[PDB]
Amino acid sequence: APPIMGSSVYITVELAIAVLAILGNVLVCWAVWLNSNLQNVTNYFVVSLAAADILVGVLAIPFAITISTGFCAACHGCLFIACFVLVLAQSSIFSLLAIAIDRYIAIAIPLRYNGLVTGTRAAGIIAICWVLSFAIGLTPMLGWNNCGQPKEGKAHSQGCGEGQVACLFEDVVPMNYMVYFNFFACVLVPLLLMLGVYLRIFAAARRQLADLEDNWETLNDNLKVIEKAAQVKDALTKMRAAALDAQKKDFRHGFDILVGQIDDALKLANEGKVKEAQAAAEQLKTTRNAYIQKYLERARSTLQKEVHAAKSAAIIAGLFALCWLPLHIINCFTFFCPDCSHAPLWLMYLAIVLSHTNSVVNPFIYAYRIREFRQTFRKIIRS
Numbered sequence: 001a002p003p004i005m006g007s008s009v010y011i012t013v014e015l016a017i018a019v020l021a022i023l024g025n026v027l028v029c030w031a032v033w034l035n036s037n038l039q040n041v042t043n044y045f046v047v048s049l050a051a052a053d054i055l056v057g058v059l060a061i062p063f064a065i066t067i068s069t070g071f072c073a074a075c076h077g078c079l080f081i082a083c084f085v086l087v088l089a090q091s092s093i094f095s096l097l098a099i100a101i102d103r104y105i106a107i108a109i110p111l112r113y114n115g116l117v118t119g120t121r122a123a124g125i126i127a128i129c130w131v132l133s134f135a136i137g138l139t140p141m142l143g144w145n146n147c148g149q150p151k152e153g154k155a156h157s158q159g160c161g162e163g164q165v166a167c168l169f170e171d172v173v174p175m176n177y178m179v180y181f182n183f184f185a186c187v188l189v190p191l192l193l194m195l196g197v198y199l200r201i202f203a204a205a206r207r208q209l210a211d212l213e214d215n216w217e218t219l220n221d222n223l224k225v226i227e228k229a230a231q232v233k234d235a236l237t238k239m240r241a242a243a244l245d246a247q248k249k250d251f252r253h254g255f256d257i258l259v260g261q262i263d264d265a266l267k268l269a270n271e272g273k274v275k276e277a278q279a280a281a282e283q284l285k286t287t288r289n290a291y292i293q294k295y296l297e298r299a300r301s302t303l304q305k306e307v308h309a310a311k312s313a314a315i316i317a318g319l320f321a322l323c324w325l326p327l328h329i330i331n332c333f334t335f336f337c338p339d340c341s342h343a344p345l346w347l348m349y350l351a352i353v354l355s356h357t358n359s360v361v362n363p364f365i366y367a368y369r370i371r372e373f374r375q376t377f378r379k380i381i382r383s
């Protein structure tokens with residue numbers, strides 16, 4: 001069949017993807033500018049991520065359509081066209097990595113976060129990443145390419161002038177750079193690092209919840225042994241150690257009557273007044289229900305709020321890896337198996353449009369998983 005027929009379908013799908021990539025991600029940057037609640041260090045990385053997805057539809061996708069024609073051009077002008085999308089992919093990887101680290105510091109060392117992670121330092125970190133992404137993505141232009149061994153039979157058949165070449169990715173971009181340098185070092189290694197950071201995040205949160213529950217059960221279980229008891233001095237000692245262990249306002253009050261009531265009943269045991277030491281220790285049961293019980297339930301909800309946020313960010317990085325791995329696996333076959341038959345053009349088309357689809361999914365996740373984004377999105381849509 002005519003080659004223009006199948007080309008029109010691929011061009012149509014690519015042009016539609018760019019429209020959704022530009023529209024949705026601009027809506028993300030608009031919400032962060034208006035709503036001040038969205039103006040935190042974690043969201044400055046998702047705006048840098050949205051800018052990379054906006055630039056995919058404005059530049060990378062139009063570049064991909066020009067590559068498909070095999071037009072004649074200077075080999076270095078062809079290099080910038082074929083390799084610019086690598087600059088945007090590296091920027092997203094660093095943005096995903098930075099997001100995972102931010103949520104780790106928030107759950108591991110929550111007290112120092114506001115002093116550790118500041119808005120003026122992230123603006124330089126984002127700038128450092130974008131400059132480094134241009135270096136990684138444009139590495140073939142520094143000499144690691146195939147401009148010195150041009151395909152003349154393809155250049156003569158295409159009618160290319162002197163100094164030009166049939167602009168094709170697999171012709172000017174070496175496949176050892178794509179597999180060893182791009183996929184392994186710059187993509188796979190940071191992705192595995194992202195998997196490790198999220199493991200330590202979910203485990204630490206599961207341990208903090210378990211530590212809080214046991215500190216509550218130690219406060220309750222030992223309340224039954226003082227009332228059914230030197231035996232009262234033992235439990236009142238496990239009282240305090242577990243009371244301050246759970247200390248990690250109205251709460252600061254409630255702990256003061258708690259540690260105070262346990263202190264009063266403690267000395268009543270050192271001098272033998274057992275029945276009075278008992279009676280002085282069932283009055284702290286009222287303080288437990290009116291103050292210490294409320295602090296524990298509030299911290300459990302706050303813990304879930306941070307975990308839900310860590311889950312949402314973990315989904316974004318997972319969707320990235322799913323949309324980009326099929327393309328890299330196909331390159332591993334072209335490189336590691338020369339006796340294999342090269343992947344057909346339709347499968348390559350499917351791998352290109354699948355990698356482009358990652359520039360559309362992220363604004364959907366924020367609206368579905370982050371309430372503040374969804375509400376802010378509605379105010380702009382209504383107005």
Ligand SMILES: CC(C)CCC[C@@H](C)[C@H]1CC[C@H]2[C@@H]3CC=C4C[C@@H](O)CC[C@]4(C)[C@H]3CC[C@]12C
Pocket residue numbers: 072073074076077078080081
């Ligand atoms: C602000 C935005 C839109 C700027 C966009 C700049 C783009 C469109 C420009 C900048 C550099 C340009 C390339 C530079 C060199 C060559 C080699 C030549 O033989 C064919 C054109 C080609 C391949 C150019 C295509 C267009 C190009 C990629």
Ligand SMILES: CC(C)CCC[C@@H](C)[C@H]1CC[C@H]2[C@@H]3CC=C4C[C@@H](O)CC[C@]4(C)[C@H]3CC[C@]12C
Pocket residue numbers: 322325326327329330333334340341342343344347
């Ligand atoms: C990345 C996750 C979702 C797994 C997806 C599976 C993909 C990447 C796998 C499954 C089957 C694979 C194909 C199986 C056989 C061949 C024939 C060979 O001559 C070229 C590679 C090619 C065409 C493979 C390319 C990669 C492939 C399409």
Ligand SMILES: CC(C)CCC[C@@H](C)[C@H]1CC[C@H]2[C@@H]3CC=C4C[C@@H](O)CC[C@]4(C)[C@H]3CC[C@]12C
Pocket residue numbers: 188329332333336337
């Ligand atoms: C951390 C995980 C996701 C890494 C993914 C593993 C990658 C690197 C693995 C999985 C499947 C592998 C391919 C499976 C089959 C073949 C055919 C063989 O004739 C050459 C090697 C080749 C082409 C392998 C190359 C490496 C490969 C692509």
Ligand SMILES: CCn1c(=O)c2c(nc(/C=C\c3ccc(O)c(O)c3)n2C)n(CC)c1=O
Pocket residue numbers: 064067068069082085169170178327331348349352355
């Ligand atoms: C993300 C990196 N990357 C690649 O890894 C790649 C590639 N193009 C090929 C393969 C050739 C090919 C693909 C589509 C076509 O229309 C065509 O005419 C030829 N590869 C292996 N693109 C260009 C779209 C690309 O940017």
Ligand SMILES: CCCCCCCC/C=C\CCCCCCCC(=O)O
Pocket residue numbers: 015018019057058062065066069071
């Ligand atoms: C929403 C994104 C809109 C993008 C609009 C631009 C899309 C088309 C871009 C340039 C097409 C490539 C130009 C190459 C000239 C023809 C090549 C040839 O005939 O040999």
Ligand SMILES: CCCCCCCC/C=C\CCCCCCCC(=O)O
Pocket residue numbers: 341344347350
């Ligand atoms: C939704 C289905 C779209 C079409 C299939 C998408 C991906 C299929 C996965 C791999 C199947 C193997 C494809 C290889 C084609 C034949 C290879 C050959 O001709 O030697």
Ligand code: NA
Pocket residue numbers: 049052053092358359
């Ligand atoms: Na992206």
